[PDB]
Design a protein around this motif. Sequence first.
Motif, PDB file in Angstrom:
ATOM      1  N   UNK A   1      18.712  10.334  61.332  1.00 33.31           N
ATOM      2  CA  UNK A   1      17.452  10.028  62.203  1.00 33.31           C
ATOM      3  C   UNK A   1      17.416  11.266  63.048  1.00 33.31           C
ATOM      4  N   UNK A   2      18.234  12.365  63.166  1.00 32.08           N
ATOM      5  CA  UNK A   2      18.427  13.377  64.281  1.00 32.08           C
ATOM      6  C   UNK A   2      18.292  14.480  63.396  1.00 32.08           C
ATOM      7  N   UNK A   3      17.964  15.938  63.811  1.00 33.52           N
ATOM      8  CA  UNK A   3      17.941  17.086  63.047  1.00 33.52           C
ATOM      9  C   UNK A   3      18.729  17.910  63.613  1.00 33.52           C
ATOM     10  N   UNK A   4      19.426  18.635  62.924  1.00 31.30           N
ATOM     11  CA  UNK A   4      20.384  19.836  63.222  1.00 31.30           C
ATOM     12  C   UNK A   4      19.612  21.313  63.135  1.00 31.30           C
ATOM     13  N   UNK A   5      19.562  22.035  64.178  1.00 32.89           N
ATOM     14  CA  UNK A   5      19.166  23.580  63.999  1.00 32.89           C
ATOM     15  C   UNK A   5      19.997  24.530  64.526  1.00 32.89           C
ATOM     16  N   UNK A   6      20.064  25.583  63.967  1.00 28.12           N
ATOM     17  CA  UNK A   6      21.093  26.642  64.981  1.00 28.12           C
ATOM     18  C   UNK A   6      20.201  27.953  64.566  1.00 28.12           C
ATOM     19  N   UNK A   7      21.110  29.008  65.224  1.00 27.48           N
ATOM     20  CA  UNK A   7      20.550  30.433  65.696  1.00 27.48           C
ATOM     21  C   UNK A   7      20.233  31.062  64.345  1.00 27.48           C
ATOM     22  N   UNK A   8      20.904  30.650  63.073  1.00 27.15           N
ATOM     23  CA  UNK A   8      20.995  31.459  61.833  1.00 27.15           C
ATOM     24  C   UNK A   8      20.109  31.191  60.881  1.00 27.15           C
ATOM     25  N   UNK A   9      19.442  29.833  61.057  1.00 24.00           N
ATOM     26  CA  UNK A   9      18.767  29.163  59.948  1.00 24.00           C
ATOM     27  C   UNK A   9      17.457  29.849  59.541  1.00 24.00           C
ATOM     28  N   UNK A  10      17.159  30.185  58.452  1.00 25.19           N
ATOM     29  CA  UNK A  10      16.090  30.848  58.234  1.00 25.19           C
ATOM     30  C   UNK A  10      14.934  29.920  57.707  1.00 25.19           C
ATOM     31  N   UNK A  11      13.570  30.583  57.962  1.00 25.08           N
ATOM     32  CA  UNK A  11      12.398  29.644  57.524  1.00 25.08           C
ATOM     33  C   UNK A  11      12.007  30.173  56.121  1.00 25.08           C
ATOM     34  N   UNK A  12      11.334  29.221  55.386  1.00 24.41           N
ATOM     35  CA  UNK A  12      10.616  29.083  53.816  1.00 24.41           C
ATOM     36  C   UNK A  12      10.241  30.417  53.984  1.00 24.41           C
ATOM     37  N   UNK A  13       9.665  30.972  54.910  1.00 21.04           N
ATOM     38  CA  UNK A  13       8.475  32.231  54.953  1.00 21.04           C
ATOM     39  C   UNK A  13       9.726  33.305  54.662  1.00 21.04           C
ATOM     40  N   UNK A  14      10.748  33.526  55.824  1.00 22.80           N
ATOM     41  CA  UNK A  14      11.798  34.427  55.664  1.00 22.80           C
ATOM     42  C   UNK A  14      12.392  34.576  54.271  1.00 22.80           C
ATOM     43  N   UNK A  15      12.776  33.383  53.733  1.00 24.92           N
ATOM     44  CA  UNK A  15      13.232  33.059  52.322  1.00 24.92           C
ATOM     45  C   UNK A  15      12.585  33.809  51.321  1.00 24.92           C
ATOM     46  N   UNK A  16      11.107  33.501  51.372  1.00 25.56           N
ATOM     47  CA  UNK A  16      10.246  34.155  50.404  1.00 25.56           C
ATOM     48  C   UNK A  16      10.416  35.665  50.441  1.00 25.56           C
ATOM     49  N   UNK A  17      10.503  36.399  51.473  1.00 24.57           N
ATOM     50  CA  UNK A  17      10.463  37.793  51.611  1.00 24.57           C
ATOM     51  C   UNK A  17      11.745  38.218  51.495  1.00 24.57           C
TER      52      UNK A  17
ATOM     53  N   UNK B   1      19.591  29.678  50.936  1.00 20.41           N
ATOM     54  CA  UNK B   1      19.940  28.039  50.607  1.00 20.41           C
ATOM     55  C   UNK B   1      18.448  27.296  51.098  1.00 20.41           C
ATOM     56  N   UNK B   2      17.839  26.689  50.304  1.00 18.08           N
ATOM     57  CA  UNK B   2      16.955  26.077  50.751  1.00 18.08           C
ATOM     58  C   UNK B   2      16.853  24.824  51.353  1.00 18.08           C
ATOM     59  N   UNK B   3      18.150  24.041  51.408  1.00 19.45           N
ATOM     60  CA  UNK B   3      18.212  22.745  51.817  1.00 19.45           C
ATOM     61  C   UNK B   3      18.520  23.041  53.411  1.00 19.45           C
ATOM     62  N   UNK B   4      18.927  24.260  53.766  1.00 20.19           N
ATOM     63  CA  UNK B   4      19.410  24.699  55.273  1.00 20.19           C
ATOM     64  C   UNK B   4      18.211  25.357  55.929  1.00 20.19           C
ATOM     65  N   UNK B   5      16.989  25.099  55.504  1.00 18.10           N
ATOM     66  CA  UNK B   5      15.730  26.221  55.937  1.00 18.10           C
ATOM     67  C   UNK B   5      14.970  25.348  56.891  1.00 18.10           C
ATOM     68  N   UNK B   6      14.229  26.139  57.729  1.00 13.95           N
ATOM     69  CA  UNK B   6      13.387  25.579  58.489  1.00 13.95           C
ATOM     70  C   UNK B   6      11.864  25.894  57.691  1.00 13.95           C
ATOM     71  N   UNK B   7      11.499  24.279  57.412  1.00 14.64           N
ATOM     72  CA  UNK B   7      10.099  24.238  56.607  1.00 14.64           C
ATOM     73  C   UNK B   7       8.994  24.290  57.425  1.00 14.64           C
ATOM     74  N   UNK B   8       8.760  25.358  58.452  1.00 16.44           N
ATOM     75  CA  UNK B   8       7.594  25.810  58.941  1.00 16.44           C
ATOM     76  C   UNK B   8       6.341  25.857  58.075  1.00 16.44           C
ATOM     77  N   UNK B   9       5.067  25.356  58.283  1.00 14.58           N
ATOM     78  CA  UNK B   9       3.803  25.863  57.497  1.00 14.58           C
ATOM     79  C   UNK B   9       3.794  27.315  57.342  1.00 14.58           C
ATOM     80  N   UNK B  10       3.651  28.079  56.371  1.00 17.36           N
ATOM     81  CA  UNK B  10       3.524  29.302  56.137  1.00 17.36           C
ATOM     82  C   UNK B  10       2.171  29.848  56.340  1.00 17.36           C
TER      83      UNK B  10
END
Lengths: 237, 300
Positions: B136-152, B154-163
């Motif tokens: 019910x809580x959400x882990x974030x850290x300094x190194x996690x990449x976004x879906x957008x950074x990943x496109x340019x 590991x997708x399970x550990x991504x930040x799914x911000x709207x592109x």
Amino acid sequence: GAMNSSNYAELFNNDIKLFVDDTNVYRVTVHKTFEGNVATKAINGCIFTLNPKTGHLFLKIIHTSVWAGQKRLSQLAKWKTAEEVSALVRSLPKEEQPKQIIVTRKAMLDPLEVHMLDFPNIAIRPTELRLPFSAAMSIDKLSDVVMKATEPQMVLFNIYDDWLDRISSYTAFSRLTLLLRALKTNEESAKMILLSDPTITIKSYHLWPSFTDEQWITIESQMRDLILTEYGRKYNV
Amino acid sequence: MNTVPFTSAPIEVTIGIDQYSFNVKENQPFHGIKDIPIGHVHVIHFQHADNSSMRYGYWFDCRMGNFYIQYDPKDGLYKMMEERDGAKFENIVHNFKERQMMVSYPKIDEDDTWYNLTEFVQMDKIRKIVRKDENQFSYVDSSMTTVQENELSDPAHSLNYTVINFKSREAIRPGHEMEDFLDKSYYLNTVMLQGIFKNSSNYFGELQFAFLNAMFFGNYGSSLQWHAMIELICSSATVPKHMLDKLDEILYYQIKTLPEQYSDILLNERVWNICLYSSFQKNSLHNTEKIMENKYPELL
């Protein structure tokens, strides 16, 4: 990335590519009004789209009617250019479509990228080369078709005439840029060099005179002399 | 007032709770944070004293369960866990409070800073950006990449911000190339607000969450998203007046809270100069323009 002196031979490989020069798209004369303000009057322009390997020139004539009631014309001219290059690419069969489009002015990159989103595999590149394609309107037959146009028109030319029968693309492009640089630097003197000997004519189906291989060497030397003479006159050197 | 108890503090660590922070010594008798204001999301965050690499933390809402922190010596971090036994949790908290082994969430009564930074941030929207449905809580850290950074990767550990991509088919209607590129109103109002976000509150929630991950974790992809969502509004000629007024409030509090010494890494010169001085909305952000000119006049 950028096309420069380092990657020059790339222009003459077997990957289809076009140069796009937008310098002559939006052309005006500046004049005083009756009240002593300043106004512009547009004249017909053209997009200069050239295949440097084959010499095929796609000259899209920009008729003054496309500016009527439009604002920010210098901005619009870039987007109209990109719109027309995009339309030309879509008009070509797949096997004739370019793999790269090199823009002579960096301000064309965004407009052309956005018009070509449907072609993600066509690279849009700038160039560090200073190319003299603004001087296209010093070629009498190109200037004439642009000025006579009464409506938007595409006119196809081979800017190398029949030179590729005798010389490589590299050498033909070198000759073309030398002739256009001389016409840009001192149009009157360049035209006098090209037409000086009445016995050498321009064929009906050509842009340039019918020089022998030996006459082209003399002409090229005279063009280099003109450019150096003008640099000495400019800088007092 | 809710409580996040700590089993222990076996490693020396700087602990953040929202905009506050406390240094804890190795094996200090520290057993958590009490008096956490109900009604907001919160973030509890960590930076180890012996390795300032990985800032990391947890977004949570005490309305959604009973949460505690326990150090894992195998994975080498402070983990958030949920306690499903209500009476056990109440008895642990009561003991630690009676022994005064907890710090108190240090909220000044006049101080609306945390509400102002989280006004539109919902735990349910956080859990869609950060996908781990078993907690019910959400882990974030300094190194996690976004879906957008990943496109340019590991997708399970991504930040799914709207592109958001200004030179994309999504941003540009065929036939309206110049129009849509110079005026992003289509992309903001039809694609993003009506289409993806459904309303300005969800859009502002994501913008606010991006800023907070950028600030609290130095998460670079989050900073990119925050600036892209600002630029998308400022680059639109047609924006509802309520959205411009709310944006000026949102950005004012974000610029107010930013540590002065992180302005060089957290603020994009191009975006801010474009947004405040060149954009359609250059005259719509009076409060933000004034705090930016007084606090960060070098950037501008």
